[PDB]
PDB file of C-alpha atoms (C1' of nucleotides) in Angstrom:
ATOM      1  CA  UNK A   1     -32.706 -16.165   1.127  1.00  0.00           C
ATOM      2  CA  UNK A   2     -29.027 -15.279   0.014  1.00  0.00           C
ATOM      3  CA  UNK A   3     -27.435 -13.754   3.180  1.00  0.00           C
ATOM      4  CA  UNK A   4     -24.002 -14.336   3.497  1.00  0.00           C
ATOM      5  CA  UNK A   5     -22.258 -14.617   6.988  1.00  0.00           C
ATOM      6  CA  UNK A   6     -19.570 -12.500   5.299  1.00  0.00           C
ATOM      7  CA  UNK A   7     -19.573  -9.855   8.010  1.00  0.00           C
ATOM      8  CA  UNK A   8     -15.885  -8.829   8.454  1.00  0.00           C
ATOM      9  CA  UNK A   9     -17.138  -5.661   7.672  1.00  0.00           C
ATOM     10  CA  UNK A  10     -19.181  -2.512   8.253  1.00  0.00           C
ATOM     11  CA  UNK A  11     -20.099  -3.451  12.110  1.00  0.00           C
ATOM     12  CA  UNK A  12     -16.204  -4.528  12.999  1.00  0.00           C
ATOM     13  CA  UNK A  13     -14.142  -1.392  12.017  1.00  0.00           C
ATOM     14  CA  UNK A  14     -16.206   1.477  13.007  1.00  0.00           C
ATOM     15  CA  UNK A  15     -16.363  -0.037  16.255  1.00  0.00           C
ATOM     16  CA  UNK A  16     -12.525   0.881  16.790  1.00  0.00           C
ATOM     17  CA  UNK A  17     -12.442   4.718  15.580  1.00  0.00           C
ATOM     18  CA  UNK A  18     -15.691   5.363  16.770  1.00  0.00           C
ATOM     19  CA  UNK A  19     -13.968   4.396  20.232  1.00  0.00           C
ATOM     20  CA  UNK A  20     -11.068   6.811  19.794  1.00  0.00           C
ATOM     21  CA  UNK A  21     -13.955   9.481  18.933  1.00  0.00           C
ATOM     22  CA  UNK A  22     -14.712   9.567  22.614  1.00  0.00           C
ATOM     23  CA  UNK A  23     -11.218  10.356  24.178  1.00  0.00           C
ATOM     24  CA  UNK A  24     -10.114  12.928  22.068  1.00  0.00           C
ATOM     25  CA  UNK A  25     -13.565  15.095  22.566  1.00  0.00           C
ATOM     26  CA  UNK A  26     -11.976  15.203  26.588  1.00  0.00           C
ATOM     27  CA  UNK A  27      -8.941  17.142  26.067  1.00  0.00           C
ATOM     28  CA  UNK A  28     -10.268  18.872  23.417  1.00  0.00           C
ATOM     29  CA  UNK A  29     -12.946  20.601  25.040  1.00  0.00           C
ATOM     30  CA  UNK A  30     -10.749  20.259  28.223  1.00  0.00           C
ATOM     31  CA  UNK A  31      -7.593  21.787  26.493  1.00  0.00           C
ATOM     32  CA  UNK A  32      -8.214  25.697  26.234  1.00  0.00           C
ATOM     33  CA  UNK A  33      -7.284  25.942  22.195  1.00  0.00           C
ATOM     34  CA  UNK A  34      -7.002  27.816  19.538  1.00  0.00           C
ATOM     35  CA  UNK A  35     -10.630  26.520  17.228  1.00  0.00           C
ATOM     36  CA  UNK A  36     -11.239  29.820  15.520  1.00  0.00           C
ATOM     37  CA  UNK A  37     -14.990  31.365  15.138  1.00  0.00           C
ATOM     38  CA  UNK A  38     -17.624  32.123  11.929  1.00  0.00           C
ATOM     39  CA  UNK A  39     -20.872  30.692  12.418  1.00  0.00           C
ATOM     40  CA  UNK A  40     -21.935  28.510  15.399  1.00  0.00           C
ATOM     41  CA  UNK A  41     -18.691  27.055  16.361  1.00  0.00           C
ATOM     42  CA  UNK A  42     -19.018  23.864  15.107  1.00  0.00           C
ATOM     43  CA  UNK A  43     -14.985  22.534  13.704  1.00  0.00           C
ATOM     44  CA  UNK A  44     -12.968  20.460  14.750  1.00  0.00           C
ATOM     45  CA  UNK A  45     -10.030  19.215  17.639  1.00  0.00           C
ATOM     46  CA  UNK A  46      -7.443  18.702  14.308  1.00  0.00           C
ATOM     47  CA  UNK A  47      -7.862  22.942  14.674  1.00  0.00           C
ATOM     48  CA  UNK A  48      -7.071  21.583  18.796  1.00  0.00           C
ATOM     49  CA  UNK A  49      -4.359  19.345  18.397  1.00  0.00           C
ATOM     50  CA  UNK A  50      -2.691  22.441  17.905  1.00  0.00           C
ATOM     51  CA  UNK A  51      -3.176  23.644  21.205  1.00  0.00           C
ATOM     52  CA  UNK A  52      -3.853  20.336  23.187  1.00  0.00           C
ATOM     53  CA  UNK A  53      -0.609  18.215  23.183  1.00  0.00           C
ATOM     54  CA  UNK A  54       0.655  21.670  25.164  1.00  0.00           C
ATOM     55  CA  UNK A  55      -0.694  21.892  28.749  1.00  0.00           C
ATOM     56  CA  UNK A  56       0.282  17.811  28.677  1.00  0.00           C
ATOM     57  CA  UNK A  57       3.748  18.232  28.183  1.00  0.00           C
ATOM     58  CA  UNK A  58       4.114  21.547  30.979  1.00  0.00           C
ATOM     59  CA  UNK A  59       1.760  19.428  33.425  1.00  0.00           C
ATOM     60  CA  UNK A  60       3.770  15.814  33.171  1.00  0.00           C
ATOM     61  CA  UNK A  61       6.935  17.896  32.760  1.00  0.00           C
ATOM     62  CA  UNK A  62       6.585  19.636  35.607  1.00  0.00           C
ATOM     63  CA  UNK A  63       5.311  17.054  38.554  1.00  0.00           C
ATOM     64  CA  UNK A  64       3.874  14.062  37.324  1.00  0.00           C
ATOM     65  CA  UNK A  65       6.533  11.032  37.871  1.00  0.00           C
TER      66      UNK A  65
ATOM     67  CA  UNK B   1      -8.743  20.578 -17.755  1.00  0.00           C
ATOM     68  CA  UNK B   2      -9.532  19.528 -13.536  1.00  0.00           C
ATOM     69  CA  UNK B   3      -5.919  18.011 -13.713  1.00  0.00           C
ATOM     70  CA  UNK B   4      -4.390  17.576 -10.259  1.00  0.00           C
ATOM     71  CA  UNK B   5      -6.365  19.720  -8.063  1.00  0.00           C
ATOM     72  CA  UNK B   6      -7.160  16.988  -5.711  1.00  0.00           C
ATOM     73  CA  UNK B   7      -4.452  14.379  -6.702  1.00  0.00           C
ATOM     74  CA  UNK B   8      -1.623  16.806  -5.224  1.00  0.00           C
ATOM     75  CA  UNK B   9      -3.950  16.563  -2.024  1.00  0.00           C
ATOM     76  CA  UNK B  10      -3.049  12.783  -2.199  1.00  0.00           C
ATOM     77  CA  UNK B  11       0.003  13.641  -0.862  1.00  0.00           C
ATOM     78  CA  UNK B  12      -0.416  16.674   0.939  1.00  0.00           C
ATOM     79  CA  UNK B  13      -3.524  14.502   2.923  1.00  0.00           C
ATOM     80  CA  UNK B  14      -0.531  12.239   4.459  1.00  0.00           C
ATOM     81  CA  UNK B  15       0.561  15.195   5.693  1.00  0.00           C
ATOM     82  CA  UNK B  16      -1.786  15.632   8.481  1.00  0.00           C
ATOM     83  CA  UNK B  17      -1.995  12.032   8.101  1.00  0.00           C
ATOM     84  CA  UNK B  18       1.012  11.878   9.629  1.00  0.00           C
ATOM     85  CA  UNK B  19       0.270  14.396  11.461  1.00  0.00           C
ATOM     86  CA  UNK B  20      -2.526  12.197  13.254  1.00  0.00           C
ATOM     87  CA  UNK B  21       0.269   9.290  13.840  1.00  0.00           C
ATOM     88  CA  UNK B  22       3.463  11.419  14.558  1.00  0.00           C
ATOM     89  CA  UNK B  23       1.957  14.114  16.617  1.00  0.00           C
ATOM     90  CA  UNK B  24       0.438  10.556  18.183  1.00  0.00           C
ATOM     91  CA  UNK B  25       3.270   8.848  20.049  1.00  0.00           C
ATOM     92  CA  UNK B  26       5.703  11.838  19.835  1.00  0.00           C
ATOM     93  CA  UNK B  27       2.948  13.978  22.545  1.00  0.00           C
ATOM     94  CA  UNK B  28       1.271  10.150  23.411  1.00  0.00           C
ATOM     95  CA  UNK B  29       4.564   8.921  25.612  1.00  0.00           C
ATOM     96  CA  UNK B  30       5.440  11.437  28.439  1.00  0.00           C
ATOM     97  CA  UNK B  31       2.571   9.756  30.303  1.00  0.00           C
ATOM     98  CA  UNK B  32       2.849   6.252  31.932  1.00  0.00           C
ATOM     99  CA  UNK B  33       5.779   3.419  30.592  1.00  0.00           C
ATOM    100  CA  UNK B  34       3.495   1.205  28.030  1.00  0.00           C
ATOM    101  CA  UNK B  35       5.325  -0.748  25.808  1.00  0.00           C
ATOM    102  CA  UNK B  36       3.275  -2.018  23.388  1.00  0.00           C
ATOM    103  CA  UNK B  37       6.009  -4.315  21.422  1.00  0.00           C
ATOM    104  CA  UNK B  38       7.756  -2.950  18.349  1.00  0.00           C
ATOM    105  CA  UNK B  39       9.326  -4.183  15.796  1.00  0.00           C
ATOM    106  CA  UNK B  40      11.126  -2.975  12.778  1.00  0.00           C
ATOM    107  CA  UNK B  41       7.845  -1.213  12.299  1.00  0.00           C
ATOM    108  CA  UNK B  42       5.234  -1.027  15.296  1.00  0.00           C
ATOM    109  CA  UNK B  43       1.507  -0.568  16.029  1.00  0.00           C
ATOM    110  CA  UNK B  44       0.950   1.943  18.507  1.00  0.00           C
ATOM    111  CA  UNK B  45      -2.260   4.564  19.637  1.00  0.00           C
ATOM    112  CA  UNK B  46      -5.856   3.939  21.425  1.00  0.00           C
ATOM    113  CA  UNK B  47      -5.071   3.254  25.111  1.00  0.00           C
ATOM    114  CA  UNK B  48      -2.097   6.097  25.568  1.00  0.00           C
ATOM    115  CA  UNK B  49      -5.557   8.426  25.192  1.00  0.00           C
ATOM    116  CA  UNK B  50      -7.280   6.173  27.613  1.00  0.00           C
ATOM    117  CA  UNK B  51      -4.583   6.547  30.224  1.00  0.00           C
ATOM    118  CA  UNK B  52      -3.986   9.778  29.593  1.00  0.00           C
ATOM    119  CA  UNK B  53      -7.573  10.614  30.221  1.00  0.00           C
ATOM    120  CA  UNK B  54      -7.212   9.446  33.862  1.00  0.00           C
ATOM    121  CA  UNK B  55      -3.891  11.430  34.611  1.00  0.00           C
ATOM    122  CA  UNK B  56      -5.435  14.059  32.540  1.00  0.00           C
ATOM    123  CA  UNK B  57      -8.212  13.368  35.713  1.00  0.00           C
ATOM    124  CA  UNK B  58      -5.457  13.675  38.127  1.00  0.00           C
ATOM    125  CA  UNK B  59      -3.075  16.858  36.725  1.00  0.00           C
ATOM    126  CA  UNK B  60      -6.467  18.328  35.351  1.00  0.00           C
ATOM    127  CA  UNK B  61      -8.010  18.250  38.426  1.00  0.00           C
ATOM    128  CA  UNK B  62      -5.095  20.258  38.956  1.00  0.00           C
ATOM    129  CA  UNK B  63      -6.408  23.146  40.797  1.00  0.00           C
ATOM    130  CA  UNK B  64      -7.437  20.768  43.107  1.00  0.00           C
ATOM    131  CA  UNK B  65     -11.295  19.698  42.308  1.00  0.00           C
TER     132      UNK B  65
ATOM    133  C1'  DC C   1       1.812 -26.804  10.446  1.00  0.00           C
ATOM    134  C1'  DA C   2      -3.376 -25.582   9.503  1.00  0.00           C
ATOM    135  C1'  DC C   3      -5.866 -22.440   8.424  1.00  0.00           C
ATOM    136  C1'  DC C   4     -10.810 -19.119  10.034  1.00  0.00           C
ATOM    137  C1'  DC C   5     -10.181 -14.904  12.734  1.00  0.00           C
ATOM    138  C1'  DG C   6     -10.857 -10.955  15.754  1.00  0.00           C
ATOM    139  C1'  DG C   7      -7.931  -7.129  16.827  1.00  0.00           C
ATOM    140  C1'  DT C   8      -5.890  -2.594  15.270  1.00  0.00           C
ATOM    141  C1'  DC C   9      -2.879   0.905  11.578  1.00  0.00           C
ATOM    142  C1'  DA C  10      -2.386   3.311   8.057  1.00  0.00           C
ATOM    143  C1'  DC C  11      -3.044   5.533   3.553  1.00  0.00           C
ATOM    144  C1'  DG C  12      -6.188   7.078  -0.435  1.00  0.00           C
ATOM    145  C1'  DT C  13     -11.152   9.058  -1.241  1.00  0.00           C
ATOM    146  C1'  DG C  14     -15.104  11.891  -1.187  1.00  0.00           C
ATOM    147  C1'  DG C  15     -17.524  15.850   0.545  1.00  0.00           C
ATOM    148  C1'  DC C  16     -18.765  20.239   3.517  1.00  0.00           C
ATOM    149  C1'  DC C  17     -17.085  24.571   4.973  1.00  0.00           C
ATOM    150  C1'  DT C  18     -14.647  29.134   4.631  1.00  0.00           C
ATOM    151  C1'  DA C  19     -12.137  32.637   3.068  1.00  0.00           C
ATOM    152  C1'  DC C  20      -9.512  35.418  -0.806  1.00  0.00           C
ATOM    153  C1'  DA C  21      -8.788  37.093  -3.936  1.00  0.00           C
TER     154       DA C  21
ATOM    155  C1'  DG D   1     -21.574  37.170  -6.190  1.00  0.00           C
ATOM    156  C1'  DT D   2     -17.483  33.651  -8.420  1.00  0.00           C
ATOM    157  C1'  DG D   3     -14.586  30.449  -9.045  1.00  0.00           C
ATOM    158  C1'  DT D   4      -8.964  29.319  -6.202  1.00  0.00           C
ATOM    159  C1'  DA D   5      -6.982  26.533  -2.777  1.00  0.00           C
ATOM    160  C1'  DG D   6      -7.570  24.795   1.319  1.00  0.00           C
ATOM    161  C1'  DG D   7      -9.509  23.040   6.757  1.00  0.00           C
ATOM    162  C1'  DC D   8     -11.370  19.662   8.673  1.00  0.00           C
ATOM    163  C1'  DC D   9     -14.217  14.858   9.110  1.00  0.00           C
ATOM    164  C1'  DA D  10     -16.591  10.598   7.651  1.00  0.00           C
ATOM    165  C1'  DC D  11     -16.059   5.978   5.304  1.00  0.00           C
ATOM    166  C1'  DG D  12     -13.573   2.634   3.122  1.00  0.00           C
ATOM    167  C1'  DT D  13      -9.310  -1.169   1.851  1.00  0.00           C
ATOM    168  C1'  DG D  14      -5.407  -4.579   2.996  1.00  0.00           C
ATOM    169  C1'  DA D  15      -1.392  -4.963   5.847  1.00  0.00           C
ATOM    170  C1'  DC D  16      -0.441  -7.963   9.918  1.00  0.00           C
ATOM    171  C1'  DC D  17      -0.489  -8.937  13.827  1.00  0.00           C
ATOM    172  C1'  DG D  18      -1.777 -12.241  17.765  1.00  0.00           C
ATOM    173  C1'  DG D  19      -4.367 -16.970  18.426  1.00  0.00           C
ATOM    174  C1'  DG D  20      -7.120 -20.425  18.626  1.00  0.00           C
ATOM    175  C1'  DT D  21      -9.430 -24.884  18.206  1.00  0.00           C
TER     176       DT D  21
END
DNA sequence: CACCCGGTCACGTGGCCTACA
DNA sequence: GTGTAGGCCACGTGACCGGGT
């Protein structure tokens, strides 16, 4: 029953993204931006980016060490 | 012909690629000394979210939740 | 020095949506 | 309706560590 241990693949990799998937879907929702409208606003925090990186800068800027 | 209409997007794809790793350490550095090693070239993203997501806790709480 | 190793990084593909002319 | 160039996002490869036994 041919089933190779060669398994340096599908199961490793997504692992990683699929981690950064949760972090960014924080300041995204939590980062007041600029995600457009049509139908059921459903796009995406590369339309955020945009906006996010902002409040950051003006909130470490301005107290944070 | 469908000549290039997708193969120009090859490069301009690297553009918000570089977006993604530019607008990363560029914004992803204000907050908390890392130091992740360099060299003449350097890995470098994941945990500067995961940091920044408990400052982002601290400065987001803000107000004063 | 020896390689089997996870780890992570990018960069190059498609596909899925959306507006405009 | 009637296709353009464009938006993003999801997966792949293949560099390249660091590191064990």
């Amino acid at each position: 029953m041919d089933e190779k241990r060669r398994a340096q693949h599908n199961e490793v990799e997504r692992r990683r993204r699929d981690k950064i998937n949760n972090w960014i879907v924080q300041l995204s929702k939590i980062i007041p931006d600029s995600s457009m409208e049509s139908t059921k606003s459903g796009q995406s925090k590369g339309g955020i980016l945009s906006k996010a990186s902002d409040y950051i800068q003006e909130l470490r800027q301005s107290n944070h060490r």
